[PDB]
Structures are given as structure tokens and as C-alpha cells.
Design a protein around this ligand. Structure first.
Ligand SMILES: [Cl-]
Ligand SMILES: [Cl-]
Lengths: 266, 266
């Protein structure tokens, strides 16, 4: 019942936690279960915002959050554990890009590899790391989708793509003399390892310049968002395709079909 | 050369970083490369402790650390990236346990599963999470070792074990009607999932009480350390076996043989 919390505290002592932090965590954890909250990511938040309205600092909230998170790891509930991430400060973004601009950026590609990167980042709206990490095995030709591996503690995801894109991928894969798992690779002294985010970033500004726009990888993911919506795709599916509980997969390949996104330039 | 850093900053803006934090990171990163330091975990530290001796706060150092770490992820150098962890505050531990005490704790086991847990935590000195996560595939009967999977960003490791221990494992595995990957499992409504750290902790106090000692999982890993050394095994190998650049594997199985650790009680 409570002897657990005594144990949780020494747990933290041994993980190198400061005896005052331990004091604090233990404090809030006890309080949490005193209310009657249950060991989930929902009751965490329904406990946290009560504090917020009661007037608690940001550093104070951040601490409570991380206290709960550490506890969940201890209970072993690692599902509920990563759900608790302190939502990032939302920035406003540059104006969304147009079809004309996207066309000019795509068409600026020196190589097919570069082209496929751009086309994926936008036609599939990938994050830079999803891209940097996407293993070629995840390009599923039978269903005509990319599977975007769920990251450190996220969820797997399935982005349908066109035959046109699936074609260029084949063409490009045929052309690959290496044993690297990854869809994209950069040449080094150590021939053929994985892309960094720096590299995607360098590469995106390159073509951004040639097509005459100050550009970033995100700008492509975001125009994906915008245009999917301009086309008349309900915001929820788009919010599905993008990641960030009615889901489907033959509807995704269907609605992404009607969008004709990538096709409307290649 | 430097246009990278401009890009690194917007990188952080988009990851939701505060424009002042970005100011700071960028500040220190520039400074780092101004010295002439090279993008590694070593020159990070040879840069950090210079600051420390120049008088920089803890929160100030922690910030610089995390600035570099974020940058490395961006360069894609994820090798050097996790090497930089701010070393945990070292606690002093309870007095090391004796052979007699270890025997009494082992022998207190209700079930074979419980016994094997205790015997591993001590005879193999595992961390609680290494234990909670060890997949049964990693029990290598041909070489007579456990392979301890390197964690989130650590390194794989190989702990030799006795035939006696390898025996009980077989016996116990024969007795397993489930399809869970893991060497140890706990019964729930959701029959046969993985152990939490709470569970190992509950279980260790149980047998700790029966044998009459206030005990923790770490106390077992630590007595492993002590006794390996009492026996005359050079501290470096022990420091190898434990994890936390001359390495070997037929020397580990050899020296761990001479220790007769587990044998000296079962
Ligand atoms: Cl279809
Ligand atoms: Cl041997």
C-alpha cells in the first residue's frame, strides 16, 4: 500500500537523486494517491492542472510531472509513463508553401536521392528524424504505404503513398550497392552510413535557395498539412497521418488517393 | 562552417525550445568551436571542467552539457551524444553482505523463479532493469554466459555464469507455458507479462525479512562486487562485468570460474 513509496524513495537515492528531490517527489506522489487518483497518465494531468489552478510554478509543475513519470517507471507502467511529456512551446510557423513553390523545390533536385527525400518529407509529411531513421524494409509495396516506425515511446503509423513515388523508390533502391538498412544514406570516409538532421537541413536549404525560398524541413511537413486540408480532407485523418480513437487504414489509402498530393507535381 | 549553427537554432525553435535557451545553447556551442574543440564527448568534458574551474554554476554546467548533447544529436553523432550524461550523485551504501547472509536469503526462496532472480541479481550482479528486461534468448548455453543487452544508449555486456545456475534456468524454462520473450514474468489478470522494478523490490525485501536483513536489489549487486574482489579478481574485470580499453571473453569465463561465486552457496 504505502511501503512501496518508502521503497520508491531509496530507489531514487540509488539512482543518484538528491535527498531533497526525493523529499519532494515522495511528497507529491503521496498526495496524488491521497486524492484517490489512479496510476494513469490521465489522472496525472487531472491532478496537475488542479495544482496549476491552485497556483504552482512552472518549475514546480515540471517537477511534479517528472515525479509521477519516475514513479510509473517504478510501477512498471511504461505505457502511461511516456504519455506524460510536458507539451512543447508551440511556435508560429512561416507561411505555408504553395504548389508552385513545392514544384520548384522538387524540380531543383540534383539527384534522385535528393528528390526522394524532398518528395517524402512533403508527400508523406515526415518529421526529419522519422526520415533519417526510416528503414527500407518499412517501404511496403504490397499495400502502397510507408510505415513510420513509432519512435522512442510513440506509436507506429502508416502513411499511404502514390505509385509514382513507389516507382522512384524502386528505381533508387535498384541503384544501391551497400548493406545499410536505411532508405537514405550519406557518403563518408566510412562509406555509406545514415543521414544526420544537419544533412537533411543542409540539403533542404540548398534546394530552397535554388527555388528562391528560405526553407526548412518542417516547412515541407507543414505544407503537407495545409494542402491535405485545402484539398478537403478532414483535419482528424490529417492529424492521424501526422501523428504528433477511431483509426483506419483502407480509408487512409482512400482519402490520401483523393488528395492527389504528390501526383499534382510529379 | 557557421551557417550550421544558425540552422541548429531554428532546429531548437521548432522542437519547442525557449528563445532564451536557444540564445544560451547557441552561445556556448559557438564558444566551444571557437576554442578549437572537436565534436566529441571528450572535448566536451575538457571544455566543461575548464568552465567549472573558471567558476560556472551547476545549473549553468548542466545547461552547457545539454547544449552540446542537443548539438551532437543534430550533427548525428549519437555515439558521442549519450556518453555525455551528467554523472549521478554517488551515495554511500549499506555494509556489504556476507556469504552467510547471501546463503540465508537465497535459501529463503519460496519458488525456483524467486530463487533464480536472487541468484542472478547476485551471482551475475545485474541491475534491476537489466534483470527486468533480460530476454531468455540472451541466456547463452553454448558459451555459458548471460549477455546483458546494452540499454537505451549503453553497451552490450557478457556475464559468465556457472553450470549450476545454467541448470536451474533450464529446469525453470522447461516449466513455462507462455510466449513471453522474457526470462522472468509476473502473473496478472493479463496472464504473463514482464516484471516491474517495484516487483523485484517487493520480492527482495520479502526474502530480506525472512533471512533477517533490511535488503535492497542493489545490496545484492554490490556484494557481488565485494566478493568478486575479496576472492582476488582484479578490480578492472569486475568493473567490466558490472558495466557502469582492454576487454576479453575467455578471460571473463576463466576468472569468473576461479571466483566460484554462486557455487559457494548452491
Ligand atoms: Cl487505393
Ligand atoms: Cl570455463
Amino acid at each position: 500500500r504505502d511501503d512501496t513509496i518508502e521503497e520508491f524513495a531509496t530507489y531514487l537515492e540509488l539512482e543518484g537523486k538528491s535527498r531533497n528531490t526525493v523529499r519532494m517527489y515522495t511528497y507529491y506522489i503521496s498526495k496524488f494517491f491521497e486524492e484517490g487518483h489512479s496510476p494513469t497518465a490521465r489522472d496525472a494531468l487531472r491532478f496537475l492542472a488542479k495544482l496549476k489552478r491552485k497556483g504552482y510554478s512552472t518549475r514546480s509543475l515540471n517537477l511534479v510531472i517528472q515525479a509521477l513519470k519516475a514513479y510509473f517507471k517504478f510501477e512498471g507502467l511504461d505505457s502511461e509513463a511516456e504519455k506524460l511529456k510536458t507539451p512543447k512551446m508551440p511556435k508560429t510557423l512561416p507561411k505555408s508553401l504553395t504548389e508552385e513553390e513545392v514544384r520548384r523545390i522538387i524540380n531543383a533536385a540534383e539527384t534522385l536521392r535528393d528528390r526522394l527525400i524532398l518528395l517524402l518529407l512533403y508527400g508523406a509529411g515526415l518529421r526529419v528524424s522519422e526520415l533519417c531513421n526510416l528503414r527500407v524494409e518499412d517501404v511496403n509495396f504490397e499495400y502502397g504505404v510507408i510505415v513510420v516506425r513509432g519512435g522512442k515511446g510513440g506509436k507506429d503509423r502508416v502513411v499511404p503513398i502514390s505509385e509514382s513515388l513507389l516507382s522512384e523508390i524502386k528505381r533508387y533502391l535498384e541503384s544501391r550497392n551497400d548493406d545499410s538498412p536505411y532508405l537514405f544514406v550519406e557518403m563518408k570516409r566510412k562509406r555509406k552510413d545514415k543521414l544526420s538532421p544537419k544533412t537533411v537541413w543542409r540539403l533542404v536549404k540548398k534546394y530552397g535557395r535554388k527555388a528562391g525560398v528560405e526553407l526548412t524541413p518542417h516547412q515541407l511537413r507543414h505544407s503537407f498539412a495545409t494542402h491535405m486540408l485545402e484539398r478537403g480532407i478532414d483535419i482528424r485523418i490529417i492529424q492521424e497521418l501526422l501523428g504528433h480513437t477511431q483509426i483506419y487504414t483502407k480509408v487512409s489509402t482512400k482519402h490520401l488517393k483523393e488528395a492527389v498530393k504528390k501526383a499534382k507535381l510529379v
